[PDB]
XYZ file of C-alpha atoms in Angstrom:
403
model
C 31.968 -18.652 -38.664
C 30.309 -21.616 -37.331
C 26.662 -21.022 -38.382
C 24.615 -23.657 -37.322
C 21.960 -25.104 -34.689
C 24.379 -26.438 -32.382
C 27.369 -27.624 -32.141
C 29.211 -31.381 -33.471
C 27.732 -33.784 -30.782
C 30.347 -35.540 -28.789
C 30.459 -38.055 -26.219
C 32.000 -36.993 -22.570
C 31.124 -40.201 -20.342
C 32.281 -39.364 -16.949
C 35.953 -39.971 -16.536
C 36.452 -43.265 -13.847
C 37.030 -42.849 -10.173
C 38.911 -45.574 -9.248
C 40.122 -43.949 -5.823
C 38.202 -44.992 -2.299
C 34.639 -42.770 -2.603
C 33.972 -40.129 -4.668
C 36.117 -38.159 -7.299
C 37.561 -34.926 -5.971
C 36.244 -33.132 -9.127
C 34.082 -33.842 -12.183
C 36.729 -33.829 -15.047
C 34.499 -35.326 -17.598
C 32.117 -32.546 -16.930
C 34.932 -29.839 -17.259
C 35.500 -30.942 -20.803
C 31.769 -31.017 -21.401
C 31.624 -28.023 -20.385
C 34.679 -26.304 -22.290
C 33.757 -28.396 -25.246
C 30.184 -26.903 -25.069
C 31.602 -23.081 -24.029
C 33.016 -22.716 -27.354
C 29.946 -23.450 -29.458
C 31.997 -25.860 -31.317
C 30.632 -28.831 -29.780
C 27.180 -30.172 -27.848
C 28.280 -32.811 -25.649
C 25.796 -35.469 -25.103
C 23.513 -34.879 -21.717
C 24.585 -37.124 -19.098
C 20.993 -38.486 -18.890
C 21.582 -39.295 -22.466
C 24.557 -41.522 -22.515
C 23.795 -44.767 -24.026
C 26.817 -46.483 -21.466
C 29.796 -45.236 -19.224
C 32.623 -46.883 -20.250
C 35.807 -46.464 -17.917
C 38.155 -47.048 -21.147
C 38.390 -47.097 -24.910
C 37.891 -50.406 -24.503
C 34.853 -50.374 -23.029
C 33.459 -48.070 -25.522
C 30.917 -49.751 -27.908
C 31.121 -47.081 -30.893
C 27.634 -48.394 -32.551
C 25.585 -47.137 -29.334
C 27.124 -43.626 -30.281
C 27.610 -43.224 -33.822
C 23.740 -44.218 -33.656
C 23.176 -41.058 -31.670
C 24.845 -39.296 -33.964
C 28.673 -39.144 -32.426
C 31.508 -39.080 -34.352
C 34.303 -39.020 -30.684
C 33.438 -39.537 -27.351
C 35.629 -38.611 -24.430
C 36.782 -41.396 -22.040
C 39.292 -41.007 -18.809
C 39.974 -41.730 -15.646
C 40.821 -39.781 -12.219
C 42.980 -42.033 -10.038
C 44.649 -40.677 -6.359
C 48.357 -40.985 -5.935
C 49.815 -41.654 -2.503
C 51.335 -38.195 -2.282
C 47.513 -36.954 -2.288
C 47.983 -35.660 -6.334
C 45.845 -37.294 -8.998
C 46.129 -39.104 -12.027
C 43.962 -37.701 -14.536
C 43.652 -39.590 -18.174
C 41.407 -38.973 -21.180
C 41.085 -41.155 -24.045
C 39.324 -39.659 -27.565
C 37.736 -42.527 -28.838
C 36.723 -42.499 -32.535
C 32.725 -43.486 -32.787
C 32.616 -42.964 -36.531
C 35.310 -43.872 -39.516
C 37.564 -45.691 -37.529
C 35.694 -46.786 -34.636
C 37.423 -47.797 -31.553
C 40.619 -46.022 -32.148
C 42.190 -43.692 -29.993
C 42.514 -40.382 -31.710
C 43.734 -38.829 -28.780
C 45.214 -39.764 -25.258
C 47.320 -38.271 -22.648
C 47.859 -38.665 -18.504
C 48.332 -35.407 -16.297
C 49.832 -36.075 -12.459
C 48.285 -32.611 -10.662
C 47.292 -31.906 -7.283
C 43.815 -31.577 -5.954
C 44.291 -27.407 -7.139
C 45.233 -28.423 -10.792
C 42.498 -30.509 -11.072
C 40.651 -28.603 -13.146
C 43.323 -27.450 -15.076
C 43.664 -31.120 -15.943
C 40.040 -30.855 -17.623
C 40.757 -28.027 -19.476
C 44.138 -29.796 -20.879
C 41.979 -32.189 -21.778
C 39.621 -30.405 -23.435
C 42.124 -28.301 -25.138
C 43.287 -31.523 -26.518
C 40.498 -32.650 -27.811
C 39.432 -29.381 -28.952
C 42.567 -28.573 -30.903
C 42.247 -32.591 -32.553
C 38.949 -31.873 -33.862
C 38.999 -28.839 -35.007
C 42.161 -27.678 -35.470
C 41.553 -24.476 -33.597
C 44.084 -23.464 -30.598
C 41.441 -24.473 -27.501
C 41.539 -21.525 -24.823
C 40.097 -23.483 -22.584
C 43.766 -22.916 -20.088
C 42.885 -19.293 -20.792
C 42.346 -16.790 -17.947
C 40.469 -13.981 -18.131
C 40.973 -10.510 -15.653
C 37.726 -8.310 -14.254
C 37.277 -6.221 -11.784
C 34.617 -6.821 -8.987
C 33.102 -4.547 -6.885
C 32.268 -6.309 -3.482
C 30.255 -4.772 -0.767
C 33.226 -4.064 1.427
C 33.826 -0.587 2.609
C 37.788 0.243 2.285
C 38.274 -1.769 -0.605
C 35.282 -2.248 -2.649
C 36.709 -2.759 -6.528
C 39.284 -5.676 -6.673
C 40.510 -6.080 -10.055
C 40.756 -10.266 -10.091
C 42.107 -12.947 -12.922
C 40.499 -16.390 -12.934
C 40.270 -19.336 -15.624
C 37.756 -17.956 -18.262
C 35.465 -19.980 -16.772
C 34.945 -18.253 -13.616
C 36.911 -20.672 -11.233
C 40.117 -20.185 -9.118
C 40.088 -16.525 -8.595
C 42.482 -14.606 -7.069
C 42.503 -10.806 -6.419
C 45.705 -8.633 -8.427
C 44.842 -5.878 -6.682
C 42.281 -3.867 -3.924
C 41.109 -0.527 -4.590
C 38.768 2.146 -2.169
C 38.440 3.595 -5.574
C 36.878 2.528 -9.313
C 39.120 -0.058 -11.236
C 38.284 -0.138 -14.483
C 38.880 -1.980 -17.978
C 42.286 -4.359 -17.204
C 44.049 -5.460 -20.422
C 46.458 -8.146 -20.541
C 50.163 -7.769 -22.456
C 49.939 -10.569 -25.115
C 52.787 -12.233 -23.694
C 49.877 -12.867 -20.645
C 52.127 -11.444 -17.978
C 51.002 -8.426 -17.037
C 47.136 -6.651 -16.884
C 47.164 -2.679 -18.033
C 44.168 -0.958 -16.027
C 42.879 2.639 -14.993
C 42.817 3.391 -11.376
C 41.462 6.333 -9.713
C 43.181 5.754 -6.429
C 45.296 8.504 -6.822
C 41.985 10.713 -6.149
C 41.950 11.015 -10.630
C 42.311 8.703 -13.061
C 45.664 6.967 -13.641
C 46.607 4.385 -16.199
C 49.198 1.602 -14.385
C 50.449 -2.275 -15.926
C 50.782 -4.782 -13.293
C 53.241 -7.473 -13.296
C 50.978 -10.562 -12.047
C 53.571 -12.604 -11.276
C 55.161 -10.080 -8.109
C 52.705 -7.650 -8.333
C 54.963 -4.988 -9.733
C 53.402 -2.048 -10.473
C 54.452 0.547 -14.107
C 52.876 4.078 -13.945
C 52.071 4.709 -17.375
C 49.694 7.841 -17.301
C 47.525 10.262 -15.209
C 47.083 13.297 -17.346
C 43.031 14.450 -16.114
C 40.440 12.498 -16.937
C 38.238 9.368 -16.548
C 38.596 5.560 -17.951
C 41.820 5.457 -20.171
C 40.375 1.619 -21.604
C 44.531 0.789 -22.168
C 45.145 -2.068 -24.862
C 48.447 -3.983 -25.504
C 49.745 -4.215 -29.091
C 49.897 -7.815 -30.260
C 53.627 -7.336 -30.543
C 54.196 -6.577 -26.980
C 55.973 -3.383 -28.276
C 52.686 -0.321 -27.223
C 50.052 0.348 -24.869
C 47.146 2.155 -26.981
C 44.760 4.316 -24.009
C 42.356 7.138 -24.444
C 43.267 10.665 -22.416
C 40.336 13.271 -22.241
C 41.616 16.805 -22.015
C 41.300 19.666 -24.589
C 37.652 18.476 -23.171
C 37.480 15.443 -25.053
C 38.841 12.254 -25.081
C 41.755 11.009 -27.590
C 43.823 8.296 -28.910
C 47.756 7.834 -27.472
C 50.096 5.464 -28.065
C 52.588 4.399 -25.218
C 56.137 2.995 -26.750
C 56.740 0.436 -23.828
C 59.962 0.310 -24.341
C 60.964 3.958 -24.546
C 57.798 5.228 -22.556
C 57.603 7.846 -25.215
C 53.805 8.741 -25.937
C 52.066 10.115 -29.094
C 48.908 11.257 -29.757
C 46.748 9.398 -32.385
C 43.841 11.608 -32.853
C 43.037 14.996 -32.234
C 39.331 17.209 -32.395
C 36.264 17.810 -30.223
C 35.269 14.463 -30.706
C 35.340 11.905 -28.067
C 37.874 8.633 -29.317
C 38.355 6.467 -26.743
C 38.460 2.472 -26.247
C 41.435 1.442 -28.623
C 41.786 -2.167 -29.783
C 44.479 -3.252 -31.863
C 44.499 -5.047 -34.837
C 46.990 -8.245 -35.762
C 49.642 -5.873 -36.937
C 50.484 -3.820 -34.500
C 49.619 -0.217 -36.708
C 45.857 -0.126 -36.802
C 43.636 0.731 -34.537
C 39.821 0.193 -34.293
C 37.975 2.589 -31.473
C 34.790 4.387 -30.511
C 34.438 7.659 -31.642
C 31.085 9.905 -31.157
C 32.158 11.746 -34.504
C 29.140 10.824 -36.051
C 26.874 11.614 -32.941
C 26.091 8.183 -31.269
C 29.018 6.135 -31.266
C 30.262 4.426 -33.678
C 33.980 2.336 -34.115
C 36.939 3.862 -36.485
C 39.894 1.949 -37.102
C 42.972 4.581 -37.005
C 46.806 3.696 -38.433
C 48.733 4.937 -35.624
C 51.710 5.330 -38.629
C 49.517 7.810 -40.157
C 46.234 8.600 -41.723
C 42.928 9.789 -40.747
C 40.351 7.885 -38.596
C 37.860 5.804 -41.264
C 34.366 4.628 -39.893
C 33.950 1.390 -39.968
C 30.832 0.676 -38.764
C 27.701 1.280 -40.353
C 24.910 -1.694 -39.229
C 23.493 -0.374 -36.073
C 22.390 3.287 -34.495
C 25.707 2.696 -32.181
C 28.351 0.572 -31.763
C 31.304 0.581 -29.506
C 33.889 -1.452 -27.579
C 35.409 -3.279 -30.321
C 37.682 -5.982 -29.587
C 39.186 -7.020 -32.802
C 39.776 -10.624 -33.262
C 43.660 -12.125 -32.736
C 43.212 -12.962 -36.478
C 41.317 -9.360 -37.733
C 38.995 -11.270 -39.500
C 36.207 -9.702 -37.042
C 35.541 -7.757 -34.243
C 33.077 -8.188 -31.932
C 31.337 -4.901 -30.135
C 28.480 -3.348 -28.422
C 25.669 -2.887 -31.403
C 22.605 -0.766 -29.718
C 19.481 -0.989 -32.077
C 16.013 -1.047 -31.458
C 16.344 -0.443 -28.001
C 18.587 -3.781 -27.863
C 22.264 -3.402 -26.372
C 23.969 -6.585 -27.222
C 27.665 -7.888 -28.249
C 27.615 -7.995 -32.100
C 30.020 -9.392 -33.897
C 31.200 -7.961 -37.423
C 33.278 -9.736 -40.156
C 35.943 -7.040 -41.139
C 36.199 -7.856 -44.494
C 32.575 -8.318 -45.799
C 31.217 -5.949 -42.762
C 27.902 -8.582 -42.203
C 26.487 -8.064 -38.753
C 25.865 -10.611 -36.323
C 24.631 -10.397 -33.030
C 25.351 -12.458 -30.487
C 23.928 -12.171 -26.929
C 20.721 -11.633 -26.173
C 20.881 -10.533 -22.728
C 20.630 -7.120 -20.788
C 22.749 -4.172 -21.440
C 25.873 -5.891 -22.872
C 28.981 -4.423 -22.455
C 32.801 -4.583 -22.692
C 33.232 -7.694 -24.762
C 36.395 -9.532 -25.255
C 37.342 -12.201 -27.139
C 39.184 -15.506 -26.627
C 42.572 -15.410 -28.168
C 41.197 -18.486 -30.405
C 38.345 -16.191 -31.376
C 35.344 -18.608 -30.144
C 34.243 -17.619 -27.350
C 33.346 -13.570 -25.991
C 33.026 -13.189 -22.383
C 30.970 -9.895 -21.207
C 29.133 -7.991 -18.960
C 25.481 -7.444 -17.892
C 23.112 -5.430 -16.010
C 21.627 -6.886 -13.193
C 19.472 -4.352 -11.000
C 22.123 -1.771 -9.945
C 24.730 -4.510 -10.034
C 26.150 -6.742 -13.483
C 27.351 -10.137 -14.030
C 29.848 -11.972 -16.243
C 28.691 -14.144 -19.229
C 29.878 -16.086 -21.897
C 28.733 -16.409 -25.557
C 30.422 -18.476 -28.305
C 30.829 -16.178 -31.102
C 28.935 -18.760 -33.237
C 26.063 -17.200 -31.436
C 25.591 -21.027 -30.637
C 26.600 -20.648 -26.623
C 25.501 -18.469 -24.385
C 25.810 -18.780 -20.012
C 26.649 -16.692 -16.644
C 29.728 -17.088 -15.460
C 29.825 -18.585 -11.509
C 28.153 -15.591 -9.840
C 30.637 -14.366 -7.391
C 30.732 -11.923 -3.889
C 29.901 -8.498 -6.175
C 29.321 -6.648 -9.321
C 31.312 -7.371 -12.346
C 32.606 -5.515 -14.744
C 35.512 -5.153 -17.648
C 35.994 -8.407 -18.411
C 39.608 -9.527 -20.868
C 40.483 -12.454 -22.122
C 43.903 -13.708 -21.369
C 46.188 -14.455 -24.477
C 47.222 -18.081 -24.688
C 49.133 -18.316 -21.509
């Protein structure tokens, strides 16, 4: 719902270093980077800064409101004695009231929160200028499948960025399509390491382990309710895949939806009732949106010769999905309420999108030879990168909620 070229220029001057040689990370260039993720902003190229200042003070607003910048992004990165770091970012109005701090705050973190630092800062400054929740603190789950023999799929959470991975769990067998509870806890995910398919939530905290499922099949694609209260999943046998609902609390399961045709990859909408999934009803796929409280499955997408893998926005405003046309597989997004198309990425053989719980950002898969990568678009359509290639092929990526 952004629109345009790029995004609102913004200044991020490289934060000051005031400790003995070099800075132990590049905070200014975290928040450029966030800043620029989200399609909201274009930070200014570093080769384009008209000066560096260290502090508000230092900042000469003409030399940036003449480049067209209403903020820029000032700080500082100083090392305490007990090896943490000081790490300080100033918004500095460039425009109406030049000079003025709009925005300030100091984190003390160790070298391993560093980055987390930047993305507090960028959250900040996000959440000031736009009034948008940032995600930037966000994390988002996938699983990776590394050329190891015993345990080649390791189902891993990281910021949404890519950095500071860390494995949740090692499989000999396919992991496949984690979901996080919305209270950002625990990741719901179908494991075939009982020889069949199995659908299990994971406490990531201890690395407690629910069995929720096994009945025979393949990929259950599980899917927290907003309210924390269900785990929508798809189970395929009658010889085709269905819609159930798991009442976390009771562990009582219902079926959704019933018939030959194949309804799998549930995504809830904001309320809790309604689900939106893929069902090859109308021969290729195409997404349905369900009320688990009743009612019959209603088609609700009609742009496109398939579409699939919704992820419905935390706001259901839109959804974004897999649109095939023209020989094109790319993430599409699709306002709910006036049903215009739009899509998004432009690279190969998108799959499994999932949104950022502020709606702004999509991170997804794509092909690669026999392999697949991570990548990132702004759902603006304004962003669009690879995530930090890592030791395998990626697939299923979900966005944490805000943690």
């Amino acid at each position: 719902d952004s629109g345009v070229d790029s995004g609102r220029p913004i200044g991020v001057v490289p934060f000051q270093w005031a400790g003995p040689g070099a800075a132990p990370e590049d905070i200014g260039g975290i928040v450029a980077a966030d800043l620029r993720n989200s399609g909201k902003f274009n930070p200014l190229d570093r080769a384009r800064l008209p000066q560096q200042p260290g502090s508000a003070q230092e900042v000469q607003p003409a030399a940036w409101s003449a480049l067209g910048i209403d903020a820029v992004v000032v700080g500082q990165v100083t090392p305490n004695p007990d090896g943490s770091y000081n790490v300080a970012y100033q918004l500095v109005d460039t425009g109406g009231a030049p000079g003025t701090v709009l925005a300030q705050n100091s984190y003390k973190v160790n070298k391993q929160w560093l980055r987390y630092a930047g993305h507090t800062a960028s959250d900040e400054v996000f959440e000031k200028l736009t009034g948008i929740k940032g995600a930037f603190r966000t994390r988002i789950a996938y699983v990776v499948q590394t050329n190891g023999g015993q345990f080649p799929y390791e189902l891993r959470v990281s910021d949404y960025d890519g950095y500071n991975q860390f494995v949740v769990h090692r499989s000999p067998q396919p992991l496949m399509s984690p979901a996080w509870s919305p209270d950002g806890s625990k990741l719901a995910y179908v494991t075939f390491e009982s020889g069949r398919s199995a659908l299990v939530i994971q406490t990531l905290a201890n690395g407690a382990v629910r069995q929720v499922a096994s009945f025979p099949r393949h990929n259950g694609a599980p899917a927290f309710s907003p309210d924390g209260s269900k785990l929508a999943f798809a189970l395929s046998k009658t010889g085709s895949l269905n819609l159930y609902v798991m009442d976390l609390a009771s562990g009582q399961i219902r079926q959704v939806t019933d018939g030959r045709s194949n309804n799998t990859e549930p995504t809830w909408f904001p309320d809790s009732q309604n689900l939106a999934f893929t069902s090859d009803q109308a021969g290729r796929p195409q997404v349905y949106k369900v009320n688990i409280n009743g009612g019959a499955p209603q088609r609700i997408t009609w742009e496109g010769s398939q579409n699939q893998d919704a992820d419905v926005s935390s706001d259901g405003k839109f959804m974004v999905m897999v649109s095939s046309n023209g020989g094109q597989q790319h993430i599409a997004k699709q306002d709910l309420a006036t049903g215009g198309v739009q899509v998004l990425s432009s690279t190969f053989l998108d799959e499994t999108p999932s949104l950022a719980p502020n709606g702004t950002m999509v991170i997804y898969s794509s092909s690669q030879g026999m392999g697949s990568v991570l990548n990132l678009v702004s759902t603006d359509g304004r962003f669009k990168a690879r995530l930090p290639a890592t030791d395998g092929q990626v697939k299923f990526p979900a966005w944490s909620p805000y943690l």
